[PDB]
Design a protein around this nucleic acid. Structure first.
Lengths: 171, 190, 97, 146, 378, 71, 73
RNA sequence: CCUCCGAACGGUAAGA
């Protein structure tokens, strides 16, 4: 057709541009620090009367001698998966340090239970959004919920009320 | 049989490089990390190990031992964001930026480390060696001002400032702070 | 295929000839949500592009000798400055040259 | 003496003359690899098999047939440009298990293309796309009035 | 039309209401996600020897698990239990939540010295980022402790259970280039060692974070080797990861079971150790079979080894192995386009669709239609 | 014997890393005497590891038995 | 104005300048001019694929320099 | 001003 405007992607020129930008920013920071490090005197008068000063200083010092932090944290487990009255320990999920992602809590035992259940389904599954079968491949989804204020997660009451409403509609 | 080349060949080829940060002014036209917590090593089964501190290894020994310089830079950036009161994290970041031959960035980073972690020693006397001349003198003056005035940075000031005309004043200002140091008395006496 | 650096997959050869790139080679296209969009570098009534000749990127011997003399003259003075200030050349004094 | 020549500007201007990464990589199978971006990728100058076979007491005829893998890989990388019918004017020939037309006997590329479309991959791609379109038309048959 | 060498797609022809956007979205999703297209792309990638940002580190797997038992000193740095919290859903109401003290594992398999570093909750006071601080704190303590031993006890290679620790350890050990920091394919059950009630009773009720030393080879080294003690420990820890309560009963075959406070494991003899190991192995296999619906007698030897050591790989439906005869008459053309009728037997365009509009599928859906007449929504 | 001979001829990490080459990141041509000689991810600050790789002791060059007895 | 080589391998190898907007009929007329066979008695193939007269040269992606196999009707 | 527009081959899968 009439091909549109295209910027040439040059990796070497890009690296040279970044190097120049970094050098200019470093020079700016150097001069700013020099402005800051100028207003402070660098004295870090005589000899014998200085010893007299020291004697006076010795006299002077002699006279002087005489659950809230867990708000907003995400748990990568279904709420129903927790049995009632059982204390479960949640560990922090492994994340790369060079990865900005919200911290997630996870219990290892629930994880291997979920993996076993998924494999059971996969063996059972012997072979709607548009082409929903590719949602796992495209977007990559464990059930999760977020802790509220005080670390308390109160969401099962809403689901119970929904179930009660559905049953009442059935009745 | 073929028996490929020893790994020492690749090691020496990649070692050729990482040249130097400075040159002795004698060659003519033709001629790092923390160590801030140790723990004493020594019935019942529980053993609280008393932990001590030597807080750095000041002298720069390691050099050019970094592969993936930008990955290491990102990692040390992450360290300094997550643990900004960690003096040797800043020390290692400054030494890494100094190793590559990026002196000014290392100087700025050690300035930010001194600003952010001032209650330490080795950060100040490594900023003194990274900063040149009068800037180093001002940095030592700041360290003397804030750090509670009973330290070795005073001998650093006396060493780097000037001749006896200013060395005497530096030693006087040192001895005026905690007048009990034998080294300061020995330096002032001669 | 010949003059693409080996990192990008080409042979990466150096040219002392006068090889021309036809305008049909500097055009491409990409697929997006709104169909296919066509790009090209040599867009307009331009002169035929030559791959760069190696000669322009080598400093001639005379210029290099004059620059060598000037550079080492500067280095001698910087070394004298380093001696007089009890410091060593910190790779920043010798950064311009 | 030191390295009395630097070739960074030469390579920079060469990539600029060739159109940059976008202008170069469309002569290649890069878009057929479907990598999201070219940033973090890397090459392998020798495969595991080709490296392991570099010293195994092979005959001269076996080694001669093993120093051709780099050429085959180079030819396959630049295949969308070497096999073009603009270059190599002449009759085109179709590989009898795929829709690939060979504009010239390029033996170091015919083999790399026979390997890629082994086990009737062309027919399986067509069948998979047909079945995926059938499914998407099936999920939309009340609104689509089918 | 699909361009496979350039991954392009287009469509020309007649359109009917609702067809153009439908095909646009369908083709956008198909080109991005397709088994056969993925196979083609992966095959091109392998042919070109072009890989994506994964230069593999040294990797401890189930195949090189034997080399783990050499004479050099190994460590097993673990930060799984650095940030630990407890919840329980009381059946009346909301979810209680209490953070507890964490632990850092520096277990050594050659001598059994389990180095523990406890973490008080106070360190997690005003930290917007928990994972990065956990990683960097654990690496800091690793390098702090690695400098306290002499050169003859420092590790020759360090193995980290969690892959996300690879980067921090390689930064905190820059001054120490000789120790090879290695990954781990197989999930070592080292988070289960806090399930021992001594460790829990210590950590849960501890403050002022301090280092402590243990020994998981209590008196075993007097009678058994080092990598027999390690294998026994691995079995016990896998069991405690599995149940932690059934294995608690198994760890006491009698009621005396003199587990003196001087050490951690019960003082038991080797002949009874064989039997209790057999019971423990049976427990692990029985739990694996219960969870995965497999037969314990059907497991092979290497299967049991992989079960005990780490974990096993699954197989999703998206993973396709696209890598009797029914003749079919089709109206085709020959090479010259002569409009012939052929009878083929190659099974390459025979996949029946049979979706939502077939007499068989419709009748199968109509089955059980009487059971769908319960909730009569008037 | 087989283990030792496999370890000697094995592809060490430093030699494994020189086999690779970054995509699109153009290296400077060190070693005038032979262009095309390039280390891989050894020092190119590409996608390698943070620390420098260590030389394998098994690849160290040694002399023969007859040569030693003549020495 | 692109240039297409229309080759018959026995021998009729001909070089024809044509426009991209040209349909295959116009290209066949030019080949008729340069070969002597009547334009409606000329078939342009791509190894088995017959180019149809009503389709422009741009649609077939017959670019400047491409060879087209010459057959007869 | 510049008008000299060339060609064929080196392009066969081997089988059933």
């Amino acid at each position: 057709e009439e091909p549109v405007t295209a910027d040439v992607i040059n990796p070497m020129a890009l690296r040279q541009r970044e190097e120049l930008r970094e050098k200019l920013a470093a020079a700016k920071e150097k001069r700013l620090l020099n402005q800051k490090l100028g207003k402070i005197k660098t004295l870090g008068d005589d000899t014998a009367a200085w010893i007299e000063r020291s004697r006076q200083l010795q006299k002077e010092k002699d006279l002087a001698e005489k659950a809230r932090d867990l708000q907003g944290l995400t748990v990568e487990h279904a709420i129903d998966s927790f049995r009632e009255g059982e204390t479960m320990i949640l560990t922090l999920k492994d994340k790369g340090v060079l990865q900005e992602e919200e911290d997630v809590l996870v219990n290892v035992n629930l994880v291997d239970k979920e993996r076993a259940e998924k494999n059971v389904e996969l063996r059972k599954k012997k072979p709607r959004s548009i082409l929903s079968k590719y949602d796992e491949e495209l977007e990559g989804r464990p059930h999760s919920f977020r802790l509220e204020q005080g670390g308390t997660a109160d969401g099962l009451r809403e689901r119970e009320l929904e179930e009660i409403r559905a049953k009442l509609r059935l009745q | 049989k073929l028996t490929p080349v020893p790994d020492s060949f690749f090691a020496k080829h990649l070692q050729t490089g990482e040249n130097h940060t400075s040159v002795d002014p004698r060659q003519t036209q033709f001629g790092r990390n923390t160590l801030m917590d140790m723990r004493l090593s020594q019935q019942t089964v529980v053993d609280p190990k008393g932990y001590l501190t030597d807080l750095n290894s000041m002298i720069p020994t390691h050099g050019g031992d970094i592969n993936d310089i930008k990955k290491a830079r990102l990692l040390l950036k992450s360290v300094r964001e997550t643990n900004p009161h960690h003096p040797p994290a800043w020390i290692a970041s400054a030494r890494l930026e100094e190793v590559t031959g990026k002196l000014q960035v290392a100087r700025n980073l050690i300035m930010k480390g001194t600003e952010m972690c001032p209650k330490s020693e080795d950060v100040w006397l490594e900023a003194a060696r990274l900063q040149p001349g009068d800037t180093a003198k001002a940095v030592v003056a700041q360290a003397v001002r804030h750090l509670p005035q009973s330290v070795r940075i005073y001998i650093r000031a006396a060493e780097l400032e000037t001749d006896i005309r200013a060395k005497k004043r530096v030693l006087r200002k040192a001895l005026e702070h905690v007048p009990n140091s034998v080294r300061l008395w020995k330096a002032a006496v001669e | 295929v010949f003059y693409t650096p080996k990192e990008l997959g080409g042979l990466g050869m150096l040219s002392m000839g006068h090889v021309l790139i036809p305008q049909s080679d500097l055009r491409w296209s990409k697929q997006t949500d709104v169909g296919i969009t066509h790009f090209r570098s040599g867009m307009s009534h331009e002169e035929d592009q030559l791959i760069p000749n190696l000669y322009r990127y080598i400093q001639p011997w005379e210029s290099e000798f004059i620059d060598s003399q000037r550079v080492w003259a500067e280095y001698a003075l910087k070394r004298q400055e380093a001696i007089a200030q009890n410091r060593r050349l910190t790779l920043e004094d010798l950064e311009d040259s | 003496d030191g390295k009395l020549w630097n070739l960074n500007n030469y390579r920079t201007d060469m990539i600029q003359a060739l159109g940059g990464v976008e202008g170069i990589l469309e002569h290649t199978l890069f878009k057929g690899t479907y990598f999201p971006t070219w940033e973090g990728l890397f090459w392998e100058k020798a495969s595991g098999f080709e490296e392991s076979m570099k010293w195994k007491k092979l005959t001269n005829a076996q080694r001669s047939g093993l120093n051709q893998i780099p050429n085959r890989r180079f030819t396959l990388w630049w295949s969308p440009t070497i096999n073009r019918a603009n270059v190599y004017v002449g009759f085109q020939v179709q590989l009898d298990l795929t829709g690939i037309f060979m504009h010239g006997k390029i033996p170091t590329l015919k083999i790399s293309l026979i390997q890629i479309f082994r086990a009737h991959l062309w027919q399986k791609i067509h069948e998979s796309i047909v079945m995926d379109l059938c499914q998407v038309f099936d999920q939309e048959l009340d609104a689509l009035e089918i | 039309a699909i361009d496979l060498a350039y991954n392009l797609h287009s469509a020309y022809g007649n359109w009917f209401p609702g067809s153009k956007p439908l095909i646009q979205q369908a083709m956008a999703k198909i080109m991005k996600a397709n088994p056969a297209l993925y196979v083609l792309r992966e095959r091109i990638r392998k042919g070109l020897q072009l890989y994506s940002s994964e230069p593999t580190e040294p990797y401890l797997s189930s195949q090189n698990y034997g080399e783990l038992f050499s004479n050099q000193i190994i460590w097993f740095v673990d930060d799984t239990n650095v940030y630990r919290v407890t919840i329980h859903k009381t059946f009346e109401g909301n979810l209680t939540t209490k953070p507890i003290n964490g632990a850092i594992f520096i277990f050594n398999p050659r001598t059994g010295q389990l180095f523990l570093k406890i973490i008080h909750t106070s360190v997690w006071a005003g930290q917007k980022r928990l994972g990065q601080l956990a990683k960097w704190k654990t690496a800091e303590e690793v390098a702090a402790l690695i400098r306290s031993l002499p050169v003859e006890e420092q590790p020759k290679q360090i193995i980290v259970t969690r892959k996300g620790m690879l980067d921090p350890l390689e930064v905190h050990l820059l001054d120490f280039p000789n120790i090879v920091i290695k990954g781990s394919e197989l999930q070592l059950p080292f988070q289960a060692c806090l399930k021992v009630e001594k460790f829990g009773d210590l950590i849960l009720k501890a403050t002022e974070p301090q280092m402590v030393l243990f020994n998981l080879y209590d008196d075993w080294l007097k009678t058994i080797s080092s990598y027999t003690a390690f294998s026994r420990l691995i079995l016990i820890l896998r069991a405690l990861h599995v149940n932690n309560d059934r294995a608690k009963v198994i760890l006491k075959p009698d009621k005396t079971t003199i587990t003196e406070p001087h050490h951690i494991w019960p003082t038991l003899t080797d002949e009874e150790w064989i039997k209790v190991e057999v019971q423990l192995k049976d427990l692990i296999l029985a739990d694996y079979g219960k969870k995965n619906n497999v037969n314990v007698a059907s497991l092979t030897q290497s299967e049991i080894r992989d079960i005990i050591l780490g974990m096993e790989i699954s197989a999703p439906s998206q993973q396709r192995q696209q890598i009797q005869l029914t003749a079919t008459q089709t109206r085709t053309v020959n090479k010259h386009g002569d409009e012939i009728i052929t009878s083929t037997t190659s099974n390459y365009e025979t996949q029946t669709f049979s979706s939502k509009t077939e007499w068989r599928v419709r009748a199968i859906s109509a089955a059980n239609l009487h059971l769908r007449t319960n909730h009569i929504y008037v | 014997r087989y283990r030792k001979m496999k370890e000697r001829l094995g592809l060490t990490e430093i030699r494994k890393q020189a086999n690779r080459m970054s995509f699109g990141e153009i290296e400077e041509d060190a070693y005038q005497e032979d262009l095309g000689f390039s280390l891989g991810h050894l020092g190119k600050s590409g996608s390698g590891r943070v620390r420098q790789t260590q030389v394998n002791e098994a690849t160290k060059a040694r002399i023969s038995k007859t040569l030693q007895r003549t020495l | 104005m692109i240039e297409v080589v229309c080759n018959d391998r026995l021998g009729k190898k001909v070089r024809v300048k044509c426009n991209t907007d040209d349909t295959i009929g116009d290209l066949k007329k030019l080949i008729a001019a340069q070969t002597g066979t009547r334009w409606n008695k000329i078939v342009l193939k791509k190894w088995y694929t017959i180019f149809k007269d009503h389709v422009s040269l741009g649609d077939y992606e017959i670019h400047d320099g491409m060879n087209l196999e010459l057959y007869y009707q």
